Amino acid sequence: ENLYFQGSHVYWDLDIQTNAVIKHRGPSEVLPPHPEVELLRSQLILKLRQHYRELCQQREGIEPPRESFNRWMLERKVVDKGSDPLLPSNCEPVVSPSMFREIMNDIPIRLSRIKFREEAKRLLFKYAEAARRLIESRSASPDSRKVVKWNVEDTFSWLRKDHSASKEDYMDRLEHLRRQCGPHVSAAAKDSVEGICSKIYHISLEYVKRIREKHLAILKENNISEEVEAPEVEPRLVYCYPVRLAVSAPPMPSVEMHMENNVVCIRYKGEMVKVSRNYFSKLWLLYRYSCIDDSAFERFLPRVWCLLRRYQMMFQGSLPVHVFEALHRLFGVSFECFASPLNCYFRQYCSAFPDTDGYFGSRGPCLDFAPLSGSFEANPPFCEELMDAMVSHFERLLESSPEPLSFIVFIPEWREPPTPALTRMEQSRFKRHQLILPAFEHEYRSGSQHICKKEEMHYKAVHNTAVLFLQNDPGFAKWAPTPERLQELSAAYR
């Protein structure tokens, strides 16, 4: 036992070749990444984040619900017909159902759970006060304006009379008051919450154009134009390959790098990104396996800076190494539908950003990827608009291909009201098996595994995980979830 260094464990197998087959596709129209543009992109995300918390606070008196902005960017990107890889640009509808739903949940007050009797009375009073107030200062039909304006008295009077109530009595009347006020308050605040969702979208649209105009200025500065080289393709079915970019990449600015106790630090204009040593070596292997426009690999370091800076602006967990080995050995899995250069196990996968990740093996976004054959694993981020689109996307692929096709989907049952995404997959005619990993009895890998130490790598899953095998007939013939194969798969979790 003599590790190369302290964090020299390996969480990937970049030797597995793909079995994903696509029709050969032309290059993506996304512009190649440049540190100057990523630097502007990062400071525009921060401003957009600050705009968002300013709007929630001075138009609803609340802070933004945790991670709602991140969840907003995923939802917008499912429907975004725009061009920016990170920011929404051209969406319908303008108002995001995701952001609207989450802001509405914390109205008129973000509900915290209760730890005392006086604390329950505390929260109950605050809700009744904020519910009555919102109706008074914002327009409402004098019915529902007073359907609640009384229900707030009735709980107010009950608080003054019944000095014998308990902690349960208060929490019960919160929900009771919540049901009477919910429809009434939501209808009243519908205009303001939509205004927040719409303003954030339009500010994003404005930042997109600022990013593109700075980008096109750099391209014209380096004598590069936005044209189509040769879309004349011999139509054919090929094994998959990383997503390519149409416009040629310019020369990259100089970038400084130094390692400090097995942590690689990369700086551009004083802006530093970090990545642990073994993961820095992994990006090297991915870059060598995937990049074809960088002879002598002279743009590796600046493209690593853009990659780490990109995922820094952005912000699930990965499956254990021994679970991926079983999926590949038992079901031929060679490809991840939702991953990143930093957490991917195979050297072929789908990720959000084709401009920064394609150089490192990404096939681009999963929805823009139409495989005709292959055995896939899917661990999507929690976003019901993305998960719903994913199920429709997979089913279209399984419908329209005679080649063996298989999708093994991992969905944490975080909600006791199950998302229709999971419900749709349960009723899918391609479902060959459904498996439940018990809560507190299976592990995940940390989402920040690219800088976190070995001791912080693995955590036990606190919820159940549903594992569904979506396979067409040839895919089921080749990678069937037999009893003996399901035996060895669960053994990889114990």
UniProtKB/Swiss-Prot annotation:
Localization of this protein? Nucleus
Described function: Cap-specific adenosine methyltransferase that catalyzes formation of N(6),2'-O-dimethyladenosine cap (m6A(m)) by methylating the adenosine at the second transcribed position of capped mRNAs. Recruited to the early elongation complex of RNA polymerase II (RNAPII) via interaction with POLR2A and mediates formation of m6A(m) co-transcriptionally.
The positions annotated for binding S-adenosyl-L-methionine are 379-382, 440-442
This entry's Gene Ontology molecular function terms read: mRNA (2'-O-methyladenosine-N6-)-methyltransferase activity; RNA polymerase II C-terminal domain binding; RNA polymerase II C-terminal domain phosphoserine binding; S-adenosyl-L-methionine binding
- A GO BP entry: negative regulation of translation
Q: Which GO terms describe its cellular component?
A: intercellular bridge; microtubule cytoskeleton; nucleoplasm; nucleus
Activity regulation text: Cap-specific adenosine methyltransferase activity is inhibited by zinc.
The protein here is known as: mRNA (2'-O-methyladenosine-N(6)-)-methyltransferase
Which part of the full protein is shown? 174 to 668 of 704
**What does UniProt note about where in the body, tissue by tissue, this protein is expressed?**
Ubiquitous.
Assembly and oligomerization: Interacts with POLR2A; interacts with the phosphorylated C-terminal domain (CTD) of POLR2A.
Enzyme class, first EC level, given as a word: transferase
The UniProt record lists the EC number as 2.1.1.62
Residues reported in the UniProt entry to bind substrate: 71, 101, 384, 414-418
Per the UniProt entry, the effect of residue 382 to G is: Strongly reduced formation of N(6),2'-O-dimethyladenosine cap (m6A(m))
Similarity comment: family membership: Belongs to the CAPAM family.
What does the UniProt keyword field contain? Methyltransferase, Nucleus, Phosphoprotein, Transferase
